[PDB]
Symmetry: C2
Amino acid sequence: AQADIALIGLAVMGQNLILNMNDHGFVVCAFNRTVSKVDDFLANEAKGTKVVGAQSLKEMVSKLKKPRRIILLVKAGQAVDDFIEKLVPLLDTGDIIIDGGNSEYRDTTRRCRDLKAKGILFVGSGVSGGEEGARYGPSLMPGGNKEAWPHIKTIFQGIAAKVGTGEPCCDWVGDEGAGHFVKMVHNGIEYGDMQLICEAYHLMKDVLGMAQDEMAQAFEDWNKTELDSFLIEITANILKFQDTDGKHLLPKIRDSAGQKGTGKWTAISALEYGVPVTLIGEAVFARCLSSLKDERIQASKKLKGPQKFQFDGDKKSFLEDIRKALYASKIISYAQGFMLLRQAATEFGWTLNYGGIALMWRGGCIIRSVFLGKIKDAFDRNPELQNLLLDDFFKSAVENCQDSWRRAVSTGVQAGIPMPCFTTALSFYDGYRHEMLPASLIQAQRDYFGAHTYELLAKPGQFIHTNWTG
Amino acid sequence: AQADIALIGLAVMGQNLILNMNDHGFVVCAFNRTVSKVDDFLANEAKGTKVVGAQSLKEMVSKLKKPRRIILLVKAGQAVDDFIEKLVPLLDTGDIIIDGGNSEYRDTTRRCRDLKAKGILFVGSGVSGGEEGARYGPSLMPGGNKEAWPHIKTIFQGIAAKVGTGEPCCDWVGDEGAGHFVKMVHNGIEYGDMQLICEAYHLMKDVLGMAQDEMAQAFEDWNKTELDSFLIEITANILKFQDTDGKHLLPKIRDSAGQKGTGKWTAISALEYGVPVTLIGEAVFARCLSSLKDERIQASKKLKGPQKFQFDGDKKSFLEDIRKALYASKIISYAQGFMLLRQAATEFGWTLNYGGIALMWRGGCIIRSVFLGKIKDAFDRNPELQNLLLDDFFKSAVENCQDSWRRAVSTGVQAGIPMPCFTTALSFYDGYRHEMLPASLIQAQRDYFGAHTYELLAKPGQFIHTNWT
C-alpha cells in the first residue's frame, strides 16, 4: 500500500484533480471504466509524476493505504451506483467512497444511508471551478458521513483553493450529501449575480446613455468597493474588449441566453420546499425570456414603451444609486439562498456549516467575492442566524442602499427598463419586513369560494369556516 | 341498464355533482368506499329524487347503461389508482373512467396509456367552480382518450355552466390528461388574480389610508368596468362582511396563505420547459412568504423601511391608477399562462384550442370574468396567435394603462408596499417589448469564464469562442 488516494474517471476534470493532488505530493492511483485511458493518461500529462495506475478495481483497491479513499468522477446517474456496487465487496469496513460529480442530492442521501449500514463511509462532495479550478485549486463542498472527514480533510483542504487568509475553501458541509445540495444552491445564486449585473448594465446603457468603455470603467471602479467580485471583473473586461476592427464585440453578440440551464433546479427546489427564493426564479425566467428573440423582435415593432420620459438629475449621481441597488439586491439574493439551505436542513435533519458554506463559494467558484466573506463573518458571530437580513453588517448595508435602491427602481420603472431581479429583491424586502400582509384576504377568498377554512390571528392552529353567503 | 353515470366519492363536491346531473334528468349511481355514507346521501341530500345507489362495485357496474361511465372524485394520488385496479376487471372494452380530481397531468397521462392498452377509455377532466358551482354549473375540462368524448359529451355539457351566447363551458381540450394540465394552469392563474387583488388592496389601505367599506365599494365600482370578475365580486363582499361582534372579520384573520399544490406545480412546470411564467411564480412565493408569519413578526421589529413618505396627490386619481395597474398586470398574467399552454402542446404534441379554453374559463370557474371573453375574441380572430400581447385589444389596453401602471408601481416602491406581482408583470412587459436585452452580457460572461460559446446577430446557428484572456 503506497498510494494515498484513488480517482475513477480520467476526464479533464478527473485528470486535473489527480495532477493537483500530485503537485501536493500525494501518490494517486488513476483508474477508468475503460482501462485504456489509464496507460494513455500515465504516459502524457502524468509522464514523470508519482501517479500510478490500475487495470482493475481489485488492483486499485489493493494499492491504497488504509483507510482506502476512492474519488468518483463519473457521469451522474446509474454510473455512480454501478461503481459503488462493484466496490463494496472489494472494500473493508471503514473505507471511503467519495462522489465528486454533479449528483442529485436525493441520490447522495440514499447512497449515504445504504453504505453506512454496510460499514462504508460515503461522501458526496461538490466541485466547482471547471478544469482550471480542478488543476490548481477547486472549491470543494464535501458532505455525507462526517466519520470520513478526519481522513479526507488532509487531502481535500490541501488541494482546495486558497481564500487568502490561509484557510482552505473546503470544510464539512453536513450529513447525507448536503454538499451536493449546497452545490445546487450555488448554481442558482450564480444566475442571480449575473442577471443582477445585466440589469445594472441595462440602466447605464439606456438611462445614462453611456459608451462601452465608459461603462467598463464604471464597473472597474465598482470592483473597488463592496462589489469586489470576479463576475464584475470579467464584466468590465468584456465591455472594453475591442474586436478585429476598433468597434466593440458585445453589441454583435446575439441576445439569447441558456434555456435548459442547471440554475432552474434551485428555483424548483424553492417551490418544492415552499421557500420564497424569488430572485433566483426571476433570473431563470429572465434567461427563458431571452430565448424568445424572434418574438421580441416582432414585439418591438408592435409593443410600445413609456411615452414622454426624460432623465432629470445627475448622470454621476445615478451611477451611485445603481451601484447601491445592485449591492442591496445581492444581499436579498443570498438571504433567500440560506433560507433554502435552512429549510432543507430542517426537512432532513441536517446540521449545516453555513459559515463554511460561504467560504467554499468564496474561492474557486465563479460567484466568489469578498462579500461572501462578510456572510462568513455574520455566521461566525451567531451560527444560529435565521436570516442574513437580521445581522449587523447586512441590516446596516440596506439602510444606506435602500434609499438609492428605490430611486433606481422608480427611475427604471418610469424609463421602461426591465429590472426583474432589482424589483423582486425590493418586493421581497418590503414583504419580509411587514408584520401584517394582505395574505389574510387570500385566506378569506379561498374560504369564500372553496371553503378551505381559515384561522384567527389570535387563535392559531384552529381552522373555522364562515358562511359568507347566508 | 337503469343509471346513466356513476360517481364514486360522496363528498360535498361529489354530492353536488350528482344532484347537478340528477336535476338535469340523468339517473346517477352514487357510491363510496364507506358505504354508510351512501345510504346517508340517499336519505338526506337526495331526499325524494331519482338518485339511486349501490352497496358494492359489482352492484354499481350492473346499473350502468353501456358504455359504462364511472366518475372518480377521490383523493388525488394512490386512491385513484387503487380504484382503477379495482375497476378494470369489472369493465368491458369500451367503458369510460373519468377522474375529476386535481391529479397531476403526468399521472393522468400514465393512466390514459396504461388503460389504453387494456381497452379502457380514461378521461382526466378538470372540475372548477368550488362547491356552489359544482351543483348548478361547473367548468369541466375533459381530456385523455377522445374515443370516450362522444359518450360523455352530452352529460358533461348538460350540467356545465353556460354563457350569454348559449355555448357550454365544457369541450374536449386534448389528449393524455391535457385537461388536467389546463386545470393546473387554471389554478396558477387563480393564484395570480388573487395576489394581484391583494397588492391593490394593500395600496389602498397603506398608501391612500382608505377604509374597509370604502375599499369594498371601490372594488364594487371596479367590477362595473373592464375588471368585471368573480374574484373582484367576492373581494368586495368579504371586505363588507361584518362579524357577530360588529367589527369586520378580515382584520381578524391571520395572514398565512395556504396552498394544496396546483400553484407550485404550475411554476415548476414553467421552469422545467423554460416558459417565463413570472407572475404566477411570484404569487406562489408570496404565499410562502406569508406562511413565515412568526419570522416576519421578528423581522418587522428589527428591519426598517421607508419612513419619509406621504401621498401628496389625488386620492381619487391615484385609485384609478391602481385599477389600470391591476388590469394591465392581469393581461400580462394571462399572456404568460397561454405561453405555458402553447409550450405544453409543443412538448407533448397536444392540439389545444386556446380560444376554447378561454370559453371554458368564461363561466363556472373561479377566474371567470368578462375579461376572459375578450381573450376568446383574441383567438377567434387568430387561433394561431403567438402571444396575447400581440393582439390589438390587449396591446391597446396595455398602452392605455401603461402610464397609470408605472405611476402606481413607482409610488408603491417609494412607500415600501410589497407589489411582487405588479412589479414582475411590468418588468416582464418592458423585457418582452425590447428587441435588445442585457442577455448578450450574461452569455458573454459564460464564454469568458468557461469554454461556452455565443452567437452573433448576423449568423444565427454558429457558436463561437473568443480568447478573452
